Design a binder for this molecule. Sequence first.
Ligand SMILES: OC[C@H]1O[C@@H](Sc2ccc3ccccc3c2)[C@H](O)[C@@H](O)[C@H]1O
Ligand SMILES: OC[C@H]1O[C@@H](Sc2ccc3ccccc3c2)[C@H](O)[C@@H](O)[C@H]1O
Ligand SMILES: [Ca+2]
Ligand SMILES: [Ca+2]
Lengths: 121, 121
Amino acid sequence: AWKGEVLANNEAGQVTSIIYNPGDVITIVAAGWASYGPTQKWGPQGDREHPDQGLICHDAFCGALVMKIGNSGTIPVNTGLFRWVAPNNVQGAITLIYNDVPGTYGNNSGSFSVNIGKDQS
Amino acid sequence: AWKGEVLANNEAGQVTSIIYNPGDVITIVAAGWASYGPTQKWGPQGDREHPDQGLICHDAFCGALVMKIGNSGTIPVNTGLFRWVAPNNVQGAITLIYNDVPGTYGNNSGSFSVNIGKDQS
Ligand SMILES: OC[C@H]1O[C@@H](Sc2ccc3ccccc3c2)[C@H](O)[C@@H](O)[C@H]1O
Ligand SMILES: OC[C@H]1O[C@@H](Sc2ccc3ccccc3c2)[C@H](O)[C@@H](O)[C@H]1O
Ligand SMILES: [Ca+2]
Ligand SMILES: [Ca+2]
């Protein structure tokens, strides 16, 4: 199991200890308050009211938690994922990333606290 | 496991299948949008800006997901709980509830999708 913080201002992402492999079932729970700039903060679902202007993930609100698995595109994580299996051919190290516009990360603040573990399979 | 919706306007809370027994290890994941009345919606964490005007759970924000296990007082769930063990002597059916002020539930809208699973122990 892995546990740590994912900083909203961490553009490159927060590498984890978790290597997702074919057939794996995983659960993720994410918690906390972050911002992409505005003083207000949002949870790991991000800001539902916020237009998308080149977000690193277009399948999640600006300011949501997303991930990458190995070489995959971005994948929404949001509040977490319960007993979850990746699409085909998706595998490798999980990297957790705060969803904002490339280059805009520097005014960001707050972080999420995230747990990830493998489930029975 | 149990999966289901917890309606924001359900002041009595949503009874689940899960009976928490001493020594259980459980995981909950909560997703989605709900409102305690206002036009905006908030996730399972609630509204960090709204003051507590007599909420059924004083340890979570207005609009957060909380629960009752058997005869316990309300316990914060928020976005969820990772491989979590109840406090000494806490046991019984898990009821999921939207955190609002008693009797002010009628103007609530939306819901949370919640998964609960028992973990290996
Ligand atoms: O798209 C994210 C960007 O949003 C702006 S705020 C901001 C607020 C309200 C807005 C309303 C409409 C359009 C853009 C808006 C941008 C952040 O400060 C910036 O760092 C970047 O992350
Ligand atoms: O605190 C829970 C209550 O919040 C109000 S919103 C609202 C907005 C601004 C306010 C300003 C002052 C005092 C209460 C206020 C309540 C809801 O409409 C009501 O149904 C109940 O859930
Ligand atoms: Ca930003
Ligand atoms: Ca209300």
